[PDB]
């Protein structure tokens, strides 16, 4: 006849503080990566300027989309993101991007390292995130895949022979 549930209030999945903190770590590194990516995009000069200028904007697009995905995943699971500038600066694990113009070769090396750092944060929190919520780990997989692709597309400029 009927399999319908009777509750007037069915709660959603609530993330633990640890899980919330793990997604927060991913978030600040994705935002920092986005900010560094734009810095590089503006300030790269030299041989093959245009390709890097353009590829960096694609990296920024992906990182911005990723940061929105992570922050909104946090919101869906009743966690509260902090993407404010002071928090990002105080808590990012990425080495700082240097000031002023940088050569194409240096930008390639610098950004590759910073992508590598961002991915490392995602890989570090992965198993804990997966254990609590496999659906969030899938979002992490997309970020890993997308960012490591960016790393290859950027770094290959400096790879010799």
CB atoms within 10 A of CB 38: 17
Residue 38: CB minimum distance to Fe ion, A: 8
Residue number, 32 or 62, with CB nearest to a second copy: 32
Beta bridge partners of 32: none
Q: Contact between 135 and Mg ion (CB under 5 A)?
A: no
- Tell me how far apart the alpha carbons of residues 96 and 113 are, in angstroms, rounded to a whole number: 11
48: contact with Mg ion by CB under 5 A: yes
Q: Please state, as a whole number, how many other Cβ atoms lie within 10 Å of the Cβ of residue 144.
A: 16
End-to-end CA distance of the chain: 71
Query: Between residues 22 and 150, which has the closer beta carbon with respect to Mg ion?
Result: 150
Residues 118-147 that bind Fe ion (CB under 5 A): 138
Near a second copy in 77-106, by CB under 8 A: 77, 80-97, 99-103
Q: Is residue 14 marked as binding?
A: no
20 binds a second copy (CB under 8 A): no
Q: How many CB atoms lie within 10 A of CB 127?
A: 9
Known binder of ligand: residue 109?
A: no
Residues within the interface to Mg ion (CB under 5 A): 48, 51
């Amino acid at each position: 006849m009927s399999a319908r549930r009777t509750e007037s209030d069915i709660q959603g999945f609530h993330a633990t503080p640890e899980f919330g903190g793990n997604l927060q770590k991913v978030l600040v590194d994705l935002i920092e990566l986005s900010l560094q990516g734009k810095q590089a995009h503006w300030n790269v000069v030299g041989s093959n300027f245009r390709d890097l200028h353009l590829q960096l904007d694609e990296l920024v697009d992906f990182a911005r989309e990723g940061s929105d995905t992570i922050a909104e995943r946090m919101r869906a699971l009743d966690a509260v993101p902090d993407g404010r500038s002071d928090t990002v600066a105080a808590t990012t694990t990425l080495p700082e991007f240097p000031a002023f113009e940088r050569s194409t070769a240096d930008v390639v090396d610098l950004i590759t390292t910073r992508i590598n750092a961002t991915v490392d944060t995602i890989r570090r929190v992965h198993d804990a995130v997966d254990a609590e919520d496999p659906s969030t780990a899938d979002l992490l997989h997309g970020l890993i895949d997308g960012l490591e692709k960016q790393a290859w597309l950027i770094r290959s400029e400096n790879r010799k022979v």
